[PDB]
Amino acid sequence: KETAAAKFERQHMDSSTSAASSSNYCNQMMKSRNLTKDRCKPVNTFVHESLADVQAVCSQKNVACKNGQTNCYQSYSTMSITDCRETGSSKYPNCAYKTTQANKHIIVACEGNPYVPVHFDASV
Amino acid sequence: KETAAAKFERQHMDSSTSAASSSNYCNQMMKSRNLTKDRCKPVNTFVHESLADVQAVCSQKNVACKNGQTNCYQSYSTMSITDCRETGSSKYPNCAYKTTQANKHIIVACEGNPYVPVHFDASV
């Protein structure tokens, strides 16, 4: 069964780009991650920094997650992220996305042994 | 001297084809890619997606290489590859290959700075 730790890397990690490099990053990036498989996942954030630089956020500032649960942590440093949003107009099997490059702190939910990111909570 | 990745690119990149269109793709390719120069290489797989998308597996699912080395990576997406097997009848200077075509997940060894595919570990 795909694990929660691998799901996060599949949906949010991208260490080979320094940042989204063109307006098409999202449309392809999202599909290759199989995020358009059963339907337009509507919004998705990608991080272009090391898995370690990211797993390390799990030891950074502890913050309450948007769900009220307390396993979240916020990046001390800002990180290159690429934000991906379904456009009005985006429509399952033709899902379409606006790609925004940004540098901001991220919030991830952490769990298990290595302690690593299992859910992407938000960028600030 | 040919780089390990230029070599990877010569031994398995095949981006001009969606896939092998005949049982003779294999005999044709094995020879041109210089792999039958000193002996009949017995086994070898060609991948039919952009170099961009193979290099992209280098940020995909970390997996252990056949040798225990961990700089291997498994493709989130399945890919069309053509499998080439040395046939009985094949006799070095007359190498013959069985051509097998499928859509499967691939495993690459990655190395250096750009991080790129240098080794074909396996298809799943």
CA–CA min distance A62, chain B (Å): 27
Give B15-24's long-range contacts (Cβ < 8 A, gap of 24+): B15/B48, B15/B49, B15/B50, B15/B51, B17/B48, B17/B82, B18/B48, B18/B80, B19/B48, B19/B80, B19/B82, B19/B101, B20/B46, B20/B82, B20/B99, B20/B101, B22/B99, B23/B98, B23/B99, B24/B99
Distance separating alpha carbons of residues A99 and A25, to the nearest angstrom: 6
Distance separating alpha carbons of residues B92 and A105, to the nearest angstrom: 59
Centroid of chain to Cα A124 = 13
Preceding peptide of A93 cis, ω within 30°: yes
Structure's resolution in angstroms: 2.5
Domains of chain A: 1-124 (3.10.130.10)
Which amino acid would we find at residue A46? F
| Out of B56, B76, B77, closest to residue A16 by CB | B56
Which experimental approach was used here? Answer: X-ray
Distance separating alpha carbons of residues B123 and B116, to the nearest angstrom: 17
* Residues A33, B58: C-beta atoms closer than 8 Å: no
What is the distance in angstroms between the CA of the first residue and the CA of the last residue of chain B? 32
Query: What contacts B32, CB < 8 A, 6 or more positions away?
Result: none
* Residues B76, A10: C-beta atoms closer than 8 Å: yes
